């Protein structure tokens, strides 16, 4: 029943004027039906078709019957009474009906009635929406269903806007009906004022009935002429008022260009300037509603602003992502600490910052993320991961990160989408850049602020470096673990690492060095070196590595070196050795001089056999011989008692030695790809042996008798 | 206010035109009834039944009474006044009532009225449905009641489409109404225009009343003739407008073949390619709505795609089964691995593929579920149970199953509902068929592709197999466990088992063998033999089982065997012997020649005594003698020390030896139902025995000294 909102004051006034005109039409019509008599007396002395007006006085006899008088009255009413004086009430009724039809045509026309009812429904939904009350009172919890209803209302408003704004039918129809009203008012006022003077009390009729009455002309009287005259004057005044109102409406809708709305008061008041102007067929109904009252328009405008939409998105994210759900979603990363991963979420829920036990926060593909000051509520947070997220941070939150942030992992595609406050983290320890720092003709000016971080210990640039940045070389004087990945992109050192004196890890995975750098020799403090996929050819530079007396984890796997140089034996501190996925045809015996090897692995190699000198390495813990043509192993090798893991992947073994049964400290064994058919039964006599440690083929597993298999299976639970 | 959607602009125009016609008819009728007098003056000089109209003037004397004038007026009104003048208002009333009836017939006709009101209700529900906005925004989460309402609306839409699509009653009725309106307008215009000229103010009557008045012809006057002519002209104009409108409606019904609805705009805009084109009696109503507002048709389209139905099902499942409410439903099966069992669900919830820890996914009576590629998100998934479920698979998910699937259980009522992608699982270890492989008298073509599974190890055919298939014999070359549950159907081998020589189990439950097969003698690698419910009468074939050097768990329970053969002494390596549910009175002394027995079990058997040579079998761990005529336990029974479980129930045991305490490894002992009057006082000397370990009636449980009872209760604390 909410049709009155679309009727402005002028429509109400025109409706009331139409009601009054209809009342006077009914009054005049019932008078002209019940009593419309003309009283006609004949003229005996006639000049120019009119009465000539020329004992005691006596009446003049006309010798006319009553029915002759009635016939004369009827004929002079029909012929010589002005049509206006006869049909004034009927013309008034017709004009009032046409006025009402023009007024209500757009309400009754289905094409515009559908749009009007849709607009009224949407406006009333936006009017009684509690989220509108909250938005206007923004200047304490919300129901889960209310947020979903508000989101559905926002979507409904967007669909209504995209369906209605392209029509431009309601405005055109309203303009057309107002113009019809104005032109009809003009025509009716013209003809009514012209013909109102033809309603006279006394008329003269010369109706040419002489064979019936014997008289030529008659002097008539219309006793209802003065009443119809005042009725016509009253109707003329009413039509004048109606036309003035219609002219005001036409001026109102032809001066402000109602096809476009302003939405300026709310933007100047609600501080939400991001409310776009409204196009045609939707600005018009907004203008009409404003003519009713601006309250509905202001309450409706909150569904046209994207700021309110984003606020609703954030509130629904907070309400749906409850604290318990995030707490249950907490996981443990590689470093064995609490981890929370946010992937493709619209934002960071405020319940997340209630997880004071959180230590690492991962953000991936979160759009327009702003880190609120509530991060200070977190205290155990130490690492922040920004995966394709441009984070904007307030002053207190940035101070908290400047005081309580250890590591920062960011991935990016452009230098512009990295945080500009990264260099403000004075307590940062680990920095992991995995983007593209190579900008347009600059020596990596984007990271020129890396000198600010004096607490930096780990740097993991991955941007396909061509020339090592001078800022990185300068900042490496206090760096512990420098890891670089170029994905095979050429990188040149050219006496760059000689400035560092305290570096210990020098991962250069996929840096396309193609040669071992000559500057790595001066880094005596180094302990881990890894050169994976550097397309190296020769590693005969070990003779220069004797300077590194603390080196224990020389890693060179995923490379191509023809043979192991003899200079390996010169170094005796080798504790971890790695040259997997290389093409080395034989292992020199001098390599086995190192008595402290523990994690030696030479897998995926063209090896034929291992020399017996390997058995003097009692300290060996893990060995990988995957993809090697090892026909057999020396019995001296298994004389060791401190072995932990031996991986034998795809090796040509026909038998397994019977002296391996003396191995007790062994933890796990892998025999995948071997063409074995015999397994010693003495292998099962071991203090530590389970299914997980030793995995073999099921058919080969049957070569041992069941009395030990059942016993070990009994203890496999715990 | 409810059916206004079904009224286009022409229908409302015709309704208002008919209202104005009703007003004209009422006004004319009341005008004629109130006064329709004739005023007739006689002609003194007549020529061809019409007068020629041939000091001062004087009136013409007729010498007629007033009643003579009234009589001639009445006679000329009744006789010589045209019937159209007298009956115009009543004809107009009849015509407008006929037009109204034609307009409102299909609204008052129940056969069409029910369809129209149901269509309006359904369209209104689809217009403001909370899920239509979501479907259009997609181009999740929702309240459970709202989801139920959306599903009910989907079902209502589909049933309405089924009901109305084959009616063709609304379109025909509407076309017939339009045709009747057009022909009525044609005849009305014809006759009304032909007879409107017949209403005139001046009318001559020669009514032949001369003996009563003296005059032959009379010149009459009809004072209402001009007003009636104006009303008739207005009615003619209204009928012309009505006829033009109805002709436009008729042409609109013949310009597009409204029996078919394109529906292409929405199905191509919203990418719902499978939106069907609507046929007769349902395309016409959609065209009517499009005449009112196409937005209702757009909203109604999203309840017709049947892809939106799938999305609604998935959303309801996701809202119903949250991860917190789904992990609590995880269970551990017999194999002590995580199991998820879905029962009578509308589909596979999208949150079941977020359970990384899942190992067994059991699907039971879920209708037409297509396993999504998100199943690859499962990492520990190894078993897939499809119970009475036909599952369709896509390219990525089928490849993932071909890579990471171990077990497959399927129960089916017809062959067609088994997956056709089962043979695409080349990594499957065990397969379980529990349906009816006995197809329409074929050589088991339904399983002819079993040979493709190169890593098959376990077979579980329970399909009333009348004979062992050739495909099974071929594929058994590398089969470990074979289990056939024929459910009492006779099974014949006839040289069909000796091909398989690597089988370790040969379970043959309910195979109705009636005899131990002669082909089992060649399976030298067997370890377990199960012949449950085979109706074995003679088991003399034990004389041929000494060949099998790994036979340990010969099971012959649930059979009808009288005498245990003396040839048990040939067997040596039995670990578990089961002879339950048979008819055996004598336990042979040679039975205990198999000294490796651990789970010997002879319960529900007509035994008489327990032989004294049981002490010679020192490695016994379990012995259930439940439901036997065991008069008393021999003292040699307790000569064993490692016995763990001892079930002596429903036996006639009058006394129990006092040396029960000799067994320290006995954990569970049952004596319920026996004829025991006292218990040994040494029963409490058991290091490992709890309240659950002793199953006796409470009346004789208290006869033992209170100290041992209280010690037993003390052992029950934890």
DSSP B593-631: G-TT-SS-B--SS------GGGGG-TT--EEE--SS---
Q: State the best of A62, A88, A114 to mutate against chain B, taking most chain B CBs within 10 Å.
A: A114
Owner of token pair 């920062």? A408
Other Cβ atoms less than 10 A from the Cβ of A459: the count is 21
- Which residues in chain A are contacts of B39 at CB distance < 8 A? 67, 70-71, 74
Query: What is the chain B residue with the closest CA to A70?
Result: B39
CB–CB contact A211 B45 (8 Å): yes
- Which residues in chain A are contacts of B289 at CB distance < 8 A? none
> Are residues A566 and A544 in contact, defined by beta-carbon separation less than 8 angstroms?
no
Query: Coil, helix or strand for B695?
Result: strand
**Minimum distance, in Å, between the CA of residue A491 and any CA atom of chain B:** 38
- Which 8-state DSSP code applies to residue A651? B
CB–CB contact B12 A108 (8 Å): yes
> Are residues A423 and A401 in contact, defined by beta-carbon separation less than 8 angstroms?
no
Provide the pairing of β-strand A430-433 with A458-459. parallel
Distance CA B616, CA B614 (A): 5
CB–CB contact A62 B59 (8 Å): yes
> Are residues B541 and B516 in contact, defined by beta-carbon separation less than 8 angstroms?
yes
> Are residues B598 and B576 in contact, defined by beta-carbon separation less than 8 angstroms?
yes
Angle, helices B170-195 vs B283-292, to 10°: value is 60
Query: Kind and range of the H or E element at A294?
Result: helix A294-301
CB–CB contact B226 A78 (8 Å): yes
Other Cβ atoms less than 10 A from the Cβ of B578: the count is 21
> Are residues B565 and B540 in contact, defined by beta-carbon separation less than 8 angstroms?
yes
- Which residues in chain A are contacts of B58 at CB distance < 8 A? 62-63, 214
Nearest to B34 among A33, A66, A211 (CB): A33
Gaps in chain A (C–N > 2.5 Å) come after which residues?
Answer: 54, 139
> Are residues A222 and A198 in contact, defined by beta-carbon separation less than 8 angstroms?
no
Distance CA B81, CA B68 (A): 18
Distance CA B648, CA B630 (A): 9
Gaps in chain B (C–N > 2.5 Å) come after which residues?
Answer: 54, 139
> Are residues B131 and B150 in contact, defined by beta-carbon separation less than 8 angstroms?
yes
Tell me which residue of A29, A31, A157, A158 sits closest to A96, measured CA to CA.
Answer: A29
Provide the pairing of β-strand A553-555 with A645-647. unpaired
Distance CA B348, CA B385 (A): 13
The span from the first CA to the last CA of chain B, in angstroms, equals 75
Other Cβ atoms less than 10 A from the Cβ of A413: the count is 10
> Are residues B677 and B697 in contact, defined by beta-carbon separation less than 8 angstroms?
no
Taking CB atoms and an 8 Å cut-off, how many pairs form between chains A and B? 117
Query: Which tokens is B281 given?
Result: 């009696």
- Which residues in chain B are contacts of A169 at CB distance < 8 A? none
Q: State the best of A29, A42, A74 to mutate against chain B, taking most chain B CBs within 10 Å.
A: A74
- How many residues belong to chain A? 718
Extended beta strands in B453-548, E state:
458-459, 481-483, 505-507, 528-530
Give the phi and the psi of residue B239 in degrees, each rounded to 5: -65, -35
Tell me which residue of B277, B278, B261, B60 sits closest to B165, measured CA to CA.
Answer: B278
Quickly list DSSP for A207-262.
Answer: ----TTTS-S-EEEE-TTHHHHHHHHHHHHHHHHHHHHHHHHHHHHTTTS-TTS--
Tell me which residue of A360, A366, A434, A372 sits closest to A404, measured CA to CA.
Answer: A360
**Minimum distance, in Å, between the CA of residue A369 and any CA atom of chain B:** 22
CB–CB contact A152 B143 (8 Å): no
Query: What is the chain A residue with the closest CA to B323?
Result: A325
Distance CA A533, CA A561 (A): 11
CB–CB contact B66 A66 (8 Å): yes
Distance CA A505, CA A528 (A): 5
Residues near B198 by beta carbon (within 8 Å), at least 6 away in sequence: B82, B84, B85
Chain centre distance of CA A529: 45
> Are residues B351 and B326 in contact, defined by beta-carbon separation less than 8 angstroms?
yes
Q: State the best of B27, B133, B230, B289 to mutate against chain A, taking most chain A CBs within 10 Å.
A: B133
Quickly list DSSP for A69-96.
Answer: HHHHHHHHHHHSS-HHHHHHHHHHHHHH
Q: B336: burial class by Cβ within 10 Å (0-12, 13-18, 19+)?
A: exposed
CB–CB contact A210 B53 (8 Å): yes
- How many residues belong to chain B? 718
Query: Coil, helix or strand for A690?
Result: coil
Nearest to A214 among B12, B58, B226 (CB): B58
> Are residues B531 and B513 in contact, defined by beta-carbon separation less than 8 angstroms?
yes
Nearest to A110 among B7, B59, B66 (CB): B7
**Minimum distance, in Å, between the CA of residue A111 and any CA atom of chain B:** 6
Q: State the best of B13, B22, B28, B58 to mutate against chain A, taking most chain A CBs within 10 Å.
A: B58
CB–CB contact B53 A208 (8 Å): yes
Method: cryo-EM
CB–CB contact A110 B62 (8 Å): no
Tell me which residue of B624, B107, B278, B129 sits closest to A159, measured CA to CA.
Answer: B129
Query: What is the chain B residue with the closest CA to A155?
Result: B133
Strand order of the β-sheet with B202-205 is B41-42, B218-221, B202-205
Provide the pairing of β-strand A383-387 with B528-530. unpaired
**Minimum distance, in Å, between the CA of residue B346 and any CA atom of chain A:** 24
Distance CA B486, CA B429 (A): 22
DSSP H helical ranges for A128-224: 130-137, 144-164, 170-195
Give the phi and the psi of residue A431 in degrees, each rounded to 5: -125, 125
Categorise residue B490: left if φ over 0, alpha if ψ from -120 to 50, beta otherwise.
beta
Nearest to A71 among B142, B221, B230 (CB): B221
Owner of token pair 């001296």? A636
Query: Which tokens is B662 given?
Result: 């000799």
Tell me which residue of B284, B7, B178, B240 sits closest to A108, measured CA to CA.
Answer: B7
Provide the pairing of β-strand B383-387 with B360-364. parallel
Other Cβ atoms less than 10 A from the Cβ of A236: the count is 15
CA distances from B389 to A554, A642, B410, B414 (A): 57, 55, 8, 11
Query: What is the chain A residue with the closest CA to B34?
Result: A34
Q: Look at the alpha carbons of A24, A27, A30, A36 in this order and tell me if their dihedral is positive or negative.
A: negative
Residues near A463 by beta carbon (within 8 Å), at least 6 away in sequence: A433, A434, A435, A436, A437, A438, A486
Q: State the best of A37, A64, A67, A319 to mutate against chain B, taking most chain B CBs within 10 Å.
A: A67
Tell me which residue of A478, A426, A423 sits closest to A445, measured CA to CA.
Answer: A423
Nearest to A45 among B54, B56, B223 (CB): B56
Query: What is the chain A residue with the closest CA to B527?
Result: A706
Give the phi and the psi of residue B310 in degrees, each rounded to 5: -65, -40
**Minimum distance, in Å, between the CA of residue B297 and any CA atom of chain A:** 13
Distance CA A627, CA A604 (A): 4
- Which 8-state DSSP code applies to residue B59? P
Q: Which long-range contacts (CB under 8 A, 24 or more apart) does B267-276 make?
A: B267/B301, B267/B305, B269/B139, B270/B135, B270/B136, B270/B139, B270/B301, B270/B302, B271/B139, B272/B301, B272/B302, B272/B305, B272/B307, B272/B308, B274/B305, B274/B306, B274/B307, B275/B301, B275/B304, B275/B305, B276/B304
Other Cβ atoms less than 10 A from the Cβ of A669: the count is 19
Extended beta strands in B281-400, E state:
331-332, 338-343, 360-364, 370-371, 383-387, 392-393
Extended beta strands in A483-588, E state:
505-507, 528-530, 553-555, 576-578
Query: Kind and range of the H or E element at A386?
Result: strand A383-387
> Are residues B75 and B264 in contact, defined by beta-carbon separation less than 8 angstroms?
no
Owner of token pair 């069992």? B341
């Amino acid at each position: 029943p909410a049709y009155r909102i679309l009727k402005p004051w002028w429509d109400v006034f025109t409706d009331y004027i139409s009601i009054v005109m209809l009342m006077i039409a009914v009054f005049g019509g019932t008078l002209q039906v019940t009593q419309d008599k003309m009283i006609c007396l004949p003229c005996k002395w006639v000049t120019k078709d009119s009465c000539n007006d020329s004992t005691g006085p006596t009446g003049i006899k006309y010798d006319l019957d009553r029915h002759q008088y009635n016939y004369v009255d009827a004929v002079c009413y029909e012929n010589r009474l002005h049509w206006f004086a006869k049909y004034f009430p009927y013309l008034v009724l017709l004009h009032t009906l046409i006025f009402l039809a023009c007024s209500n045509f757009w309400f009754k026309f289905p094409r515009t009635s559908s749009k009007l009812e849709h607009f009224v429904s949407i406006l009333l939904k936006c009017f009684d929406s509690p989220w509108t009350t909250r938005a206007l009172s923004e200047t304490g919890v919300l129901d889960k269903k209310e947020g979903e209803q508000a989101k559905a209302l926002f979507e409904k408003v967007k669909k209504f806007r995209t369906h209605v704004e392209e029509g431009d039918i309601v405005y055109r129809l309203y303009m057309r009906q107002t113009i019809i009203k104005v032109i009809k008012f003009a025509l009716i006022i013209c003809y009514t004022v012209y013909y109102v003077h033809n309603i006279k009390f006394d008329v003269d009729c010369t109706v040419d009935i002489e064979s019936l009455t014997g008289y030529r002309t008659y002097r008539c009287a219309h006793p209802l002429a003065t009443l119809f005259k005042i009725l016509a004057s009253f109707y003329i005044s009413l039509v004048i008022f109606y036309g003035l109102i219609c002219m005001y409406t036409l001026w109102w809708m032809l001066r402000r260009s109602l096809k476009k709305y302003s939405f300026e008061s709310i933007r100047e008041e609600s501080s939400y300037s991001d409310i776009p102007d409204v196009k045609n067929d939707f600005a018009f109904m907004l203008h009409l509603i404003d003519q009713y009252d601006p309250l509905y328009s202001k309450r409706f405008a909150v569904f046209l602003s994207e700021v309110s939409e984003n606020k609703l998105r954030q509130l629904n994210l907070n309400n749906e992502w409850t604290l318990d759900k995030l707490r249950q979603r907490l996981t443990k990363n590689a470093q064995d600490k609490l981890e929370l991963h946010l992937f493709m979420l619209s934002g960071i829920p405020d319940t997340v910052f209630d997880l004071v036990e959180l230590e690492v926060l991962k953000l991936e593909l979160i759009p327009d993320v702003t880190i609120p000051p509530s991060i200070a509520q977190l205290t155990g947070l130490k690492e922040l991961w920004l995966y394709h997220t441009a984070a904007k941070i307030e002053a207190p939150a940035l101070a908290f990160l400047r005081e309580n942030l250890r590591a920062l992992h960011i991935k990016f595609t452009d230098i512009k989408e990295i945080p500009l406050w990264i260099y403000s983290l004075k307590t940062l320890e680990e920095l992991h850049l995995t983007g593209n720092l190579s900008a347009e003709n600059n020596r990596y000016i984007v990271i020129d602020g890396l000198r600010e971080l004096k607490r930096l210990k780990v740097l993991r640039l991955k941007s396909n470096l061509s020339k090592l940045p001078q800022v990185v070389t300068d900042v490496g004087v206090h760096l512990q673990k420098l890891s670089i990945n170029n994905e095979g992109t050429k990188l040149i050192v050219l006496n760059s690492l000689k400035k560092m004196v305290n570096l210990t890890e020098l991962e250069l995975i996929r840096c396309d060095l193609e040669r071992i750098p000559h500057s790595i020799f001066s880094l005596h403090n180094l302990q881990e070196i890894d050169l994976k996929d550097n397309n190296l050819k020769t590693i005969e530079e070990i003779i220069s590595f004797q300077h590194l007396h603390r080196l224990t984890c020389l890693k060179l796997w995923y490379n191509h070196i023809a043979y192991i140089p003899i200079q390996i034996g010169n170094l005796t501190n080798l504790e971890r050795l790695y040259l997997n996925r290389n093409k080395i045809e034989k292992i020199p015996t001098q390599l086995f001089y190192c008595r402290k090897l523990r994690y030696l692995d030479l897998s995926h190699n063209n090896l034929t056999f291992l020399p017996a000198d390997i058995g003097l390495l009692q300290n060996l813990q893990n060995l990988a011989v995957t993809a090697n043509r090892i026909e057999a192993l020396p019995p001296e090798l298994f004389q060791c008692r401190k072995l932990r893991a031996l991986h034998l992947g795809n090796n040509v073994l026909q038998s397994l030695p019977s002296r391996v049964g003396e191995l007790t400290n062994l933890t796990q064994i892998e025999l995948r790809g071997n063409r074995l058919e015999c397994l010693p039964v003495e292998l099962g006599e071991c203090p530590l042996l389970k299914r997980s440690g030793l995995v073999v083929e099921e058919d080969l597993f049957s070569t041992l008798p069941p009395e030990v298999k059942e016993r070990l299976w009994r203890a496999d639970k715990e």
